[PDB]
Amino acid sequence: FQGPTSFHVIQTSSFTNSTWAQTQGSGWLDDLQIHGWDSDSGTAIFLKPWSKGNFSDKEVAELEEIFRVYIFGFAREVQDFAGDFQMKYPFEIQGIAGCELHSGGAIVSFLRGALGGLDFLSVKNASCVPSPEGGSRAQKFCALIIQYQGIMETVRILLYETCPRYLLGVLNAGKADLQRQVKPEAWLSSGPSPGPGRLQLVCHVSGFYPKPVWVMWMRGEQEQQGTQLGDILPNANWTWYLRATLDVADGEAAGLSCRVKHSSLEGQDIILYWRGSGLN
Amino acid sequence: PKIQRTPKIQVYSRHPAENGKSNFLNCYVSGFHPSDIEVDLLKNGERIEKVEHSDLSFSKDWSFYLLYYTEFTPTEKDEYACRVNHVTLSQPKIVKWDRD
């Protein structure tokens, strides 16, 4: 099956000073957002009609309550401990937790945490593991967190028991959108490059879904190894944009084409041909 | 826990630009830290009010990223840009849209 294979929740907690912290949160299938967290209400925003997966409204409400209580308590506890942990304001903490479906069917769960944009801790087989970047501070944290009744048990249940069934239910519930096929459009452009009698050719590919795509500059059947891929950039409404560039001598641009292969094309690749002397 | 990251700013249209044909203008702001940031889309140097943006997210290396977008109708003369302010920037960084 195509489309996303993982669910995760993220947290960004921004600590301005000893009395002011604000948290932002959201839920994702790979890079596609499916939940928002509404700080006005302390509840989740369901971005797609199928965002609750196969969960009952009662269980969803229980999870939103767990998250609400966690977000509040976390900010409070970190403010109390900030002195004990030699913490200078302002600082930002990030967290991500979730699970992913692998080939063969295994579902693997993960939890990571960061401080100052660097890894701080992770959860490995139900245990708090300090990251080396977190140094002694992360070691003190791991020893502290496990003292809190229930916390690690709730994390264990959520990561290894709740998340896998949630993931499967939501990948099924959302399949008409998650596994849809949307065809890209493609176009060529050119520009100058630094070298003498050097040109840069650009093959633009936009509006495709799912994310996997193949784009190559070609000469007949020969793939040009010099093809440079840009970063895949998002569009609104769950499609992507990608540029594939080629640097070529002026007199050798004739004969080049761009070939695009995508799951949506039904084996009918897009082929654009570069023509010289300003003939598009 | 200390080194700040300046935003990378990429401005691109959803569809190839055709003068007079409606399109969408995207500004992808990524790789920055911390998350507090200000982003505006400009038309001929003036702030566009009808702009949408994504909820905060971050990449594997913990750098934040945001997508800002608006409907726009490009012309031969009009100039569009993305203006960003961040703690790492002395003043707002302006990246103009280039259809190329």
Ligand SMILES: *[C@@H]1O[C@H](CO[C@@H]2O[C@@H](C)[C@@H](O)[C@@H](O)[C@@H]2O)[C@@H](O[C@@H]2O[C@H](CO)[C@@H](O[C@@H]3O[C@H](CO[C@H]4O[C@H](CO)[C@@H](O)[C@H](O)[C@@H]4O)[C@@H](O)[C@H](O[C@H]4O[C@H](CO)[C@@H](O)[C@H](O)[C@@H]4O)[C@@H]3O)[C@H](O)[C@H]2NC(C)=O)[C@H](O[C@@H]2O[C@@H](C)[C@@H](O)[C@@H](O)[C@@H]2O)[C@H]1NC(C)=O
């Ligand atoms: C949301 O969906 C989850 C996924 O459901 C499946 O997939 C979706 C896409 C649709 O196709 C659904 O029709 C489909 O059910 C549900 O979670 C799954 O629930 C089923 C039972 O309905 C459960 O199956 C049981 O599995 C155990 C074995 O589990 C262990 O071993 C396996 C490996 O072999 C391992 O992977 C597991 O992690 C465990 O270690 C098994 O013993 C059960 O057998 C008994 O029951 C069956 C009848 O079903 C009977 O024939 C047998 O004879 C025997 O008595 C049974 O096969 C799935 O394993 C589980 N999968 C996941 C990943 O959790 C989910 O259901 C709810 O959670 C379940 C954990 C369980 O408590 C259910 O009763 C719950 O309703 C569902 N809803 C929610 C709210 O999460």
Ligand SMILES: CCCCCCCCCCCCC/C=C/[C@@H](O)[C@H](CO[C@@H]1O[C@H](CO)[C@@H](O[C@@H]2O[C@H](CO)[C@H](O)[C@H](O)[C@H]2O)[C@H](O)[C@H]1O)NC(=O)CCCCCCCCCCCCCCCCC
């Ligand atoms: C480093 C290792 C893990 C890293 C992150 C973990 C924490 C990070 C730092 C924490 C420091 C302090 C933060 C504050 C934590 C706490 O504030 C709170 C609770 O606090 C007390 O805990 C008690 C636990 O028993 C609880 O009791 C419950 O009470 C109820 C009514 O009585 C019911 O009866 C229940 O049954 C009973 O359990 C009590 O409310 C409460 O007050 N959080 C927690 O529970 C754990 C945090 C969980 C959130 C983060 C984990 C994310 C895992 C997610 C994977 C994806 C989710 C699954 C998919 C679903 C999506 C739709």
Ligand SMILES: *[C@@H]1O[C@H](CO[C@@H]2O[C@@H](C)[C@@H](O)[C@@H](O)[C@@H]2O)[C@@H](O[C@@H]2O[C@H](CO)[C@@H](O)[C@H](O)[C@H]2NC(C)=O)[C@H](O)[C@H]1NC(C)=O
């Ligand atoms: C801790 O910070 C809060 C939050 O506001 C900060 O200050 C603003 C002036 C600005 O710099 C924001 O970016 C910050 O987030 C402080 O609350 C402010 O307090 C001042 C006077 O104390 C008041 O004029 C503002 O209206 C307050 N704003 C809010 C949003 O509450 C707070 O006082 C700081 N606390 C300590 C102990 O320093």
Ligand SMILES: [Cl-]
């Ligand atoms: Cl909240």
Ligand SMILES: [Cl-]
């Ligand atoms: Cl995808």
Ligand code: NA
């Ligand atoms: Na609240």
